[PDB]
Amino acid sequence: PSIDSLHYLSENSKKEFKEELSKAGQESQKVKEILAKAQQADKQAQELAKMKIPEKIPMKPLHGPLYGGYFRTWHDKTSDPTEKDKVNSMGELPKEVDLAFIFHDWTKDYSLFWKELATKHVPKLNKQGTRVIRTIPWRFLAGGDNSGIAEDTSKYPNTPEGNKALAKAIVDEYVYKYNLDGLDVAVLHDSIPKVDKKEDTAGVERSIQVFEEIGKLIGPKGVDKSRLFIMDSTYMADKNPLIERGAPYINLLLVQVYGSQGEKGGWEPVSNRPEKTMEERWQGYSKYIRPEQYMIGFSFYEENAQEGNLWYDINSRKDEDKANGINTDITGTRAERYARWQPKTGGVKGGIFSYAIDRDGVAHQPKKYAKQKEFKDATDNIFHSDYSVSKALKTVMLKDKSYDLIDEKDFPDKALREAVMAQVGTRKGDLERFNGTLRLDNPAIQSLEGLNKFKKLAQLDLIGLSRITKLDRSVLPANMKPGKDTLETVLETYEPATIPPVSLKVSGLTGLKELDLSGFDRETLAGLDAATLTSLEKVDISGNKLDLAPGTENRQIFDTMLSTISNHVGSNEQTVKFDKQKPTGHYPDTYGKTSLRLPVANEKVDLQSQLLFGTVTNQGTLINSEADYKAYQNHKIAGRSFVDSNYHYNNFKVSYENYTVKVTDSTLGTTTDKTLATDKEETYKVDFFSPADKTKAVHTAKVIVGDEKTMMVNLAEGATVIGGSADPVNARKVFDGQLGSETDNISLGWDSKQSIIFKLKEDGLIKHWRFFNDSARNPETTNKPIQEASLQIFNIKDYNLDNLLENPNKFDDEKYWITVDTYSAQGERATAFSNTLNNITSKYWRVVFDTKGDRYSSPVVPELQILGYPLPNADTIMKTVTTAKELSQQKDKFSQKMLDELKIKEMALETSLNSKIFDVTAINANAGVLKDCI
Ligand SMILES: CC(=O)N[C@@H]1[C@@H](O)[C@H](O[C@@H]2O[C@H](CO[C@H]3O[C@H](CO)[C@@H](O)[C@H](O)[C@@H]3O[C@@H]3O[C@H](CO)[C@@H](O[C@@H]4O[C@H](CO)[C@H](O)[C@H](O)[C@H]4O)[C@H](O)[C@H]3NC(C)=O)[C@@H](O)[C@H](O[C@H]3O[C@H](CO)[C@@H](O)[C@H](O)[C@@H]3O[C@@H]3O[C@H](CO)[C@@H](O[C@@H]4O[C@H](CO)[C@H](O)[C@H](O)[C@H]4O)[C@H](O)[C@H]3NC(C)=O)[C@@H]2O)[C@@H](CO)O[C@H]1O
Ligand SMILES: [Ca+2]
Ligand code: NI
């Protein structure tokens, strides 16, 4: 009986039986048993082809806290009847299990477990209410590495039509083949599609398309909605590649959160806080599914588990009790906390599930034996479970008020009750947690009794409710006023949240007579369409944080309601109330003081108080002083003010201490003192910074003491290094505009004196220069300071620039350069040095620094700055100046009269090059006149 002629065995099972052939390939007596079993395996395989899948028992739709479980096929006593220690059966799962997940592995194709499942387990579990679900890995929807059916790439190509063929083939193979109740797709890192044992991106993308086609067949958006379409994952929502396009097609999301990591989250010591927490996890998924579809999972103790697969989600065997492999108490377990857990927002959860439910009741191997790979504990044997833990957990949830149905004692009005259920949910627990939008626009609503049940409602739209006549605290959500979360957590951890007060939109309540919003600390009235509240007779908005100044939207909503009430019953101290306001002072988005001009005097200004100031309400009223706020307290409505008599300018004002400052003079010198001295004529740029950010400024201003000067630029930034002893990679960092961090080595080179040869970016007129000592970057730096330095330009009159450019290193001698300024440290602590330069024009430069330290003395220069203004053709213009001066001495060639006119023009040009306001257009005009006169 060859194995190639068996017909009914799957090619996989045949690939197995022929490998077992190779072993003992010629042993006379073992070549028998392998064929004799490959046959008996074929007899079984053909009994699976001819079994009769029972007719589907119709089942009640899902409802209430659900409890699922993953039964490991290889622990069913029919998986491999030769292993007589496997005693459990999936059919024995009690009615408390709403979802029994077939979790497949190690059970042979030809196993008769599949005939016990189809013809006995499904009928039994179905008659009691338990749905049976097949679990398949992510990779079954794409790729070819263990992709099961999808390995056949010709029958199911990766195309629009191929993906449909694969989706229908999946549902047909794994759902309908045994008349199962639904399909579960597990997306983890372990199940991700691979090829060559490499994560396949083209494979992951195909799986999204195939997942969508499967959803067009089963699940809430498929042709057959009786079958469930479930997804179980370990990814956070922001890392699940299939939730965005997949979520609308699934009935339930099962997040696997085993162990204290799933519950508490992971620690991240850079934040000093936890991440991937239980609350953070669902908040991510709350964008894609309703909370009633969310199900959190734990794990029972799997036999012979090793490091990485030990979760301790159920109680552990006591170290003394060495014979007791069993523990069925839920008290103090992670699973029992998971059953009672409810998110803080949205609503209550679908339920919980357990992995390896065939191990229900088995205690956990003590933590101390985790690393002993071969230690066989009492809890590592196989037991028959009566599923006591599963029953105990299910009843815990089933007996939780959170899942009590919303009834007429919450909302006596039917029209309101039907709308709450349409938009919020159907559980009392959903009122304590729903943080979305409730739109009550059906005018049949006769009463708003019950709305006070809402604790976290984000927005409430009351539209066209003609039968409503009163609105006050008793018939509005409880979060109308600020408050903190009151739902206590049942989980473990290592402050409560703020409840954003509700946004109240009201429009078309023509029957509304009284509006009482007092004592809620409301920030605005936005949402009130006062032009529609036509029957309003009594209004009270006192004791809030409203800015009722004229011109505001708040005042106009108020004026409108006051006008309506003034045609119905009259405005008076009883029908209209508004006082006791405490508007919230905010920082402005912008500030108006963009320039401050002072005379040159020996005074002192506080830059903060003179440029950055002012508090603004959320209505846009700017208060810039204690004087404006008294004009504000002076605003009167019906003869009296609306600001609380106890709310002073000190309370309303926003504080500007902690705000830093970055002053920059016209030579690009920098300070950081709020105090400035007007003793020196100079022009400064001032940037202010909030404590929360020191890179994006909140306000820029321009202080001008005396005659305004144009601000210089760092013409050296971006300069090209072409020489110098100094390390060219590091050299170029002196032109990089920032000082740097003290992690980066910026040492120029080995010996104690180092040059840098460089060319400026664009032409320019240079008027200043500055080099920073190392103390500018880190004040505690151990790199000694520069003792002596020289800045030089290239002797272009005598030497050829082209010779320099062809062999720039040859020219590292001061004979080829001209010195324009030398620095010599006198021995005093200096963070930087700066000095003027005489309208230099050269494009090519050479600097040297010297710490004077015999050896091991490294020149460290954060940044070298050659400052000035941009000026195209500085060469020619400055060349023209020096010509008129020469001519003016040749008093024999030119008459005195010719020279006096030329002198005025040469003088005029020099004046424009050294003017405080640099004007390139005037310069060119003068230098053009001068060259023309020559
Ligand atoms: C998705 C999900 O549910 N989330 C995770 C769980 O996945 C996770 O549970 C584990 O699941 C393992 C099985 O998962 C596989 O199936 C699911 C569903 O189809 C897939 O989603 C998943 O990716 C796994 O896929 C399977 O992978 C294998 C390996 O590749 C495929 O077959 C092999 O594939 C390779 C290529 O990679 C190659 O081609 C090979 O030839 C091929 O055989 C397989 O095809 C693929 N699925 C299919 C059908 O497509 C469980 O195994 C795991 O449980 C084992 O380990 C725990 C450790 O604590 C034990 O407690 C537990 O009892 C079990 O032990 C194993 O028992 C069998 C029973 O006999 C032992 O077999 C023996 O092995 C011997 C050699 O060691 C001899 O060969 C002997 O003849 C043989 O009988 C086996 O050795 C035991 N192994 C161990 C480790 O003890 C676990 O339940 C859980 C984990 O916490 O978390 C969930 O959230
Ligand atoms: Ca630098
Ligand atoms: Ni062990």
Author numbering: 48 to 541, 548 to 987
Can you provide the manuscript's text about this entry?
EndoSD233A/E235L crystallized in the P21 space group, with one molecule in the asymmetric unit and diffracted to a maximum resolution of 2.9 Å. The EndoS glycosidase domain adopts a (β/α)8-barrel topology with a long cavity that runs parallel to the protein surface in which one molecule of the G2 glycan product is unambiguously identified in the crystal structure. Two well-defined asymmetric grooves accommodate each of the complex-type N-linked glycan antennae: the Galβ1–4GlcNAcβ1–2Manα1–6 and Galβ1–4GlcNAcβ1–2Manα1–3 arms occupy grooves 1 and 2, respectively, both attached to the disaccharide Manβ1–4GlcNAc of the G2 product. The reducing end of the core Manβ1–4GlcNAc disaccharide is located at the end of the long cavity flanked by loops 4, 5, 6, and 7, and several residues from the β-barrel core. W153 is positioned in such a way as to engage the entire G2 trimannose core including the central Man (−2), the α(1–6)-linked Man (−3) and the α(1–3)-linked Man (−7). The terminal GlcNAc (−4 and −8) and Gal (−5 and −9) residues of each arm adopt two alternative conformations into the crystal structure. In one state, the GlcNAc (−4 and −8) and Gal (−5 and −9) residues protrude away from grooves 1 and 2, which may reflect the release of the G2 product from the active site; in the other state, these carbohydrates reside within their corresponding grooves, likely reflecting the binding mode of the G2 substrate. The structural comparison between the full-length EndoSD233A/E235L-G2 and the truncated unliganded version ΔN-3HB-EndoS suggests an important contribution of the N-3HB domain to stabilize the GH domain and generate a completely competent glycan binding site.
Endoglycosidase S (EndoS) secreted from Streptococcus pyogenes is a 108 kDa enzyme that specifically catalyzes the hydrolysis of the β-1,4 linkage between the first two N-acetylglucosamine residues of the complex-type N-linked glycan located on N297 of the Fc region of IgG antibodies. The presence of this N-linked glycan is critical for IgG function, contributing both to Fc γ receptor binding and activation of the complement pathway. EndoS belongs to family GH18, for which a substrate-assisted mechanism, with retention of the anomeric configuration, has been proposed. Altogether, our data provide critical insights into the structural determinants of complex-type N-linked glycan specificity of EndoS, a key event for S. pyogenes to evade the host immune system.
